[PDB]
Amino acid sequence: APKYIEHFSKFSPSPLSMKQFLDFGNACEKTSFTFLRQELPVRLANIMKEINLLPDRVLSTPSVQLVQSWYVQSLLDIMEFLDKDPEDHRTLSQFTDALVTIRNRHNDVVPTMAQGVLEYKDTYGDDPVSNQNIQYFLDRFYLSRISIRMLINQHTLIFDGPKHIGSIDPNCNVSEVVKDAYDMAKLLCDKYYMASPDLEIQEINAANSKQPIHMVYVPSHLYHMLFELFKNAMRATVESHESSLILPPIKVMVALGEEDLSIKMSDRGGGVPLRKIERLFSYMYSTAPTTPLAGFGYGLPISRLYAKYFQGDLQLFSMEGFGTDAVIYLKALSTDSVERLPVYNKSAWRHY
Amino acid sequence: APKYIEHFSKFSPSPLSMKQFLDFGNACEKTSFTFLRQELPVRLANIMKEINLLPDRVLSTPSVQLVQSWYVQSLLDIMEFLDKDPEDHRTLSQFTDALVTIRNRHNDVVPTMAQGVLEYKDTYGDDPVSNQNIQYFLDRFYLSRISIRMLINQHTLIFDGPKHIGSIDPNCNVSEVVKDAYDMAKLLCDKYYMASPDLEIQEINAANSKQPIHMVYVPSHLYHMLFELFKNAMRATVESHESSLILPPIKVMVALGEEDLSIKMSDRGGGVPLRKIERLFSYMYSTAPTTPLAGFGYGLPISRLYAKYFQGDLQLFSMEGFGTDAVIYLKALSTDSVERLPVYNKSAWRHY
Numbered sequence: 001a002p003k004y005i006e007h008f009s010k011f012s013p014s015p016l017s018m019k020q021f022l023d024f025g026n027a028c029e030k031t032s033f034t035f036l037r038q039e040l041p042v043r044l045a046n047i048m049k050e051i052n053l054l055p056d057r058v059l060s061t062p063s064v065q066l067v068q069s070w071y072v073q074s075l076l077d078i079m080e081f082l083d084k085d086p087e088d089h090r091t092l093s094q095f096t097d098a099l100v101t102i103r104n105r106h107n108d109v110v111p112t113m114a115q116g117v118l119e120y121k122d123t124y125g126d127d128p129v130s131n132q133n134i135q136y137f138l139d140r141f142y143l144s145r146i147s148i149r150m151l152i153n154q155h156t157l158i159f160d161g162p163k164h165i166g167s168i169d170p171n172c173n174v175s176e177v178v179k180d181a182y183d184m185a186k187l188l189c190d191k192y193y194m195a196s197p198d199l200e201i202q203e204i205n206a207a208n209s210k211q212p213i214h215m216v217y218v219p220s221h222l223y224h225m226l227f228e229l230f231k232n233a234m235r236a237t238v239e240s241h242e243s244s245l246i247l248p249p250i251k252v253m254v255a256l257g258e259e260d261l262s263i264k265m266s267d268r269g270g271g272v273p274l275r276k277i278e279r280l281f282s283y284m285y286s287t288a289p290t291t292p293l294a295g296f297g298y299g300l301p302i303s304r305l306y307a308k309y310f311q312g313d314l315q316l317f318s319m320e321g322f323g324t325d326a327v328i329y330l331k332a333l334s335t336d337s338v339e340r341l342p343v344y345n346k347s348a349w350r351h352y
Numbered sequence: 353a354p355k356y357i358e359h360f361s362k363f364s365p366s367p368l369s370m371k372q373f374l375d376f377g378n379a380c381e382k383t384s385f386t387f388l389r390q391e392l393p394v395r396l397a398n399i400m401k402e403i404n405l406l407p408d409r410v411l412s413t414p415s416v417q418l419v420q421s422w423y424v425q426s427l428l429d430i431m432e433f434l435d436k437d438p439e440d441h442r443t444l445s446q447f448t449d450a451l452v453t454i455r456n457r458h459n460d461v462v463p464t465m466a467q468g469v470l471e472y473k474d475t476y477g478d479d480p481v482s483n484q485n486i487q488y489f490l491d492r493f494y495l496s497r498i499s500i501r502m503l504i505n506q507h508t509l510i511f512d513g514p515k516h517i518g519s520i521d522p523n524c525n526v527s528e529v530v531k532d533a534y535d536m537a538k539l540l541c542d543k544y545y546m547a548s549p550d551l552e553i554q555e556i557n558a559a560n561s562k563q564p565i566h567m568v569y570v571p572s573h574l575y576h577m578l579f580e581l582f583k584n585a586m587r588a589t590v591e592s593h594e595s596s597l598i599l600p601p602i603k604v605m606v607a608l609g610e611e612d613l614s615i616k617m618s619d620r621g622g623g624v625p626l627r628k629i630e631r632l633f634s635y636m637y638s639t640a641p642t643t644p645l646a647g648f649g650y651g652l653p654i655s656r657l658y659a660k661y662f663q664g665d666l667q668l669f670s671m672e673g674f675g676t677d678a679v680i681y682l683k684a685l686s687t688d689s690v691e692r693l694p695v696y697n698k699s700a701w702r703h704y
């Protein structure tokens with residue numbers, strides 16, 4: 001790898017807690033600049049080195065080379081600011097402009113890597129070992145991308161424009177986000193199917209049973225996960241009940257405990273056999289040539305990465321012949337909500 | 353390893369479907385004898401070779417050596433019949449007697465390996481890498497033991513004594529077994545706690561909605577799994593509701609689909625954080641010096657092996673502050689219900 005990738009890849013990424021993001025709210029902007037002009041090169045270089053561990057028959061394909069060419073240019077864009085003066089307000093403005101260009105440059109990274117998966121499937125095959133390696137790589141690659149976008153969004157949202165702090169809501173009303181995502185999925189379901197399940201929500205605030213459940217979170221991530229789950233639940237409910245006059249509703253429970261905030265969504269959409277659950281989270285099995293449901297795009301496994309990004313999880317358990325439950329597990333406390341970042345080391349090197 | 357272990361370990365175990373067990377019901381007894389005088393040495397030798405891949409600081413401990421001494425004697429007991437005449441009815445009688453001695457000889461294998469786990473925890477420590485290796489080894493070791501006991505039970509039950517075929521019920525009414533296990537857990541809960549949750553059962557027979565759900569299964573395995581889950585659900589319900597006059601009931605759904613038969617048990621016993629679920633399935637973290645609940649003995653992870661033994665699973669998902677669901681996944685068809693057997697090869701050798 002080039003000199004500059006070698007230098008920054010020997011650092012490991014520095015994970016931030018939701019509280020640190022929040023405690024960071026003038027002097028703030030210079031502080032963000034000097035943090036990000038080091039940290040973004042570290043995160044970019046670490047994933048670029050990991051891309052380089054893919055075999056030549058993957059590495060040399062047009063999709064991987066185009067993604068590499070983007071990351072290289074973004075890394076160079078940022079390295080221009082290493083010697084610049086944080087007191088000069090023109091430097092801070094150019095920095096923000098450059099981060100916006102970088103975010104736009106990477107907007108197509110998800111489907112671009114999909115074309116690499118697709119080419120591999122049809123030029124080398126879709127066996128379980130290939131599936132495992134694609135799953136290991138893309139989980140880490142997409143999680144790294146999520147963490148880079150988070151950093152950039154927090155800077156450009158705060159230092160271009162406070163109940164919200166960039167993309168973080170310190171008082172995120174969870175049931176309200178549930179309702180929004182449900183309404184939007186319903187609108188798509190009503191349009192395609194003239195029929196959509198109703199919604200039942202129940203809250204369990206264990207410590208304060210009469211208090212509405214709020215948390216510190218990134219509500220756009222939470223909306224995306226819920227919307228993806230609602231689309232699948234409604235589709236399954238409509239198609240499994242062609243003969244009923246009744247569509248069963250979708251039920252959601254929001255539970256707040258001492259450590260977890262959990263959201264369980266329940267459909268009666270007929271379920272799938274246990275054997276197929278792993279297929280639904282697999283990038284490789286969900287990949288085909290160009291409203292993508294579970295098993296036919298990356299919405300579900302990327303939704304799980306959003307949950308894992310701050311130490312949560314997203315799990316599915318179905319009952320074939322009846323329905324399916326999904327649980328989003330989130331950390332309840334902002335000090336436990338810490339970025340989960342892949343690192344390039346000899347422990348990651350060995351998996352390949 | 354000795355000559356005789358080397359020979360039989362180069363065969364791999366031959367897994368049987370539930371239908372094959374069943375289709376095997378005089379001439380049957382000679383057929384069982386000549387099958388088992390080869391297959392039991394194969395299964396015994398394969399696991400003995402795998403025990404020998406443990407490091408010397410595990411291998412040399414008194415617990416592992418005692419288990420090895422048992423398996424060695426059982427392997428020798430069986431090898432006596434290799435040259436004998438299946439037509440001689442005295443040989444068949446001695447064979448059954450010898451299998452009964454072997455089953456009794458191994459009755460204490462589970463807690464004996466526990467003492468080896470306990471010694472290791474306190475003489476070398478309880479780090480995650482040690483936990484992973486103990487989990488990999490004991491899952492395979494205990495599953496192998498379950499498959500050996502199954503084979504022996506089918507022979508001694510059929511050819512010493514038909515709605516039932518040995519330990520298999522071709523018409524196992526699942527809700528009835530659920531009720532039995534619930535009644536027994538309730539009796540223990542009523543005794544310790546003067547109070548026990550009631551039971552609600554619902555069935556969903558997707559193809560034939562009015563028909564009671566039956567399957568081909570080993571009902572003693574199913575009873576054990578349910579009883580273990582009910583004990584935990586009741587304990588959690590009693591302890592989390594010290595202040596309520598009401599104990600919430602435990603709900604069970606039995607779903608029959610085209611491929612899966614699924615049993616979901618639901619409590620409102622307050623739940624646990626997601627972080628602790630893995631602790632509950634871990635042998636190492638559940639091990640302590642001599643009614644063991646999840647996290648304090650091997651009932652739960654061994655219950656999961658019973659489900660996996662015929663291509664099923666047992667999964668837990670909790671909601672901290674509310675309750676916990678458990679799902680037993682079984683194969684609905686007797687031709688899909690095939691023994692899951694560990695094998696000694698270079699692929700198993702590498703994990704160590």
Ligand SMILES: CCNc1cc(F)cc2c1NC(=O)[C@@]2(C)N1CCC[C@@H](Nc2ccc(C(=O)O)c(Cl)c2)C1
Nearest residue numbers: 232233236265266267269271272293294295324326
């Ligand atoms: C409470 C939230 N509910 C759910 C959430 C999910 F993320 C997934 C599902 C849910 N509810 C379902 O029923 C489920 C499982 N489906 C939704 C409709 C599409 C469907 N996809 C399939 C189905 C079958 C196959 C196959 O191999 O035959 C294949 Cl490739 C793909 C998945």
Ligand SMILES: CCNc1cc(F)cc2c1NC(=O)[C@@]2(C)N1CCC[C@@H](Nc2ccc(C(=O)O)c(Cl)c2)C1
Nearest residue numbers: 584585588617618619621623624645646647676678
């Ligand atoms: C529908 C079936 N229900 C359930 C099934 C389970 F197999 C487990 C549970 C269930 N329902 C619970 O609540 C659960 C999770 N408990 C039951 C009571 C005992 C309890 N054990 C513990 C708890 C906390 C810790 C700790 O680290 O603090 C530890 Cl070591 C151990 C587990």
Ligand SMILES: CC(C)c1ccc(COc2ccc(CC(=O)NCCN)cc2Cl)cc1
Nearest residue numbers: 054055058113116117120130133134137352
């Ligand atoms: C396009 C991206 C998402 C993508 C597409 C395809 C792949 C496939 O990656 C594989 C496939 C097989 C093996 C085993 C092997 O034989 N290794 C040989 C090592 N030289 C290793 C890897 Cl990393 C990964 C990532």
Ligand SMILES: CC(C)c1ccc(COc2ccc(CC(=O)NCCN)cc2Cl)cc1
Nearest residue numbers: 406407410465468469472482485486489704
């Ligand atoms: C008693 C039984 C259940 C038991 C108790 C304890 C253990 C612990 O087994 C370990 C622990 C560490 C390592 C890594 C290592 O450093 N390996 C060195 C290889 N020479 C490998 C193994 Cl197989 C297994 C089984």
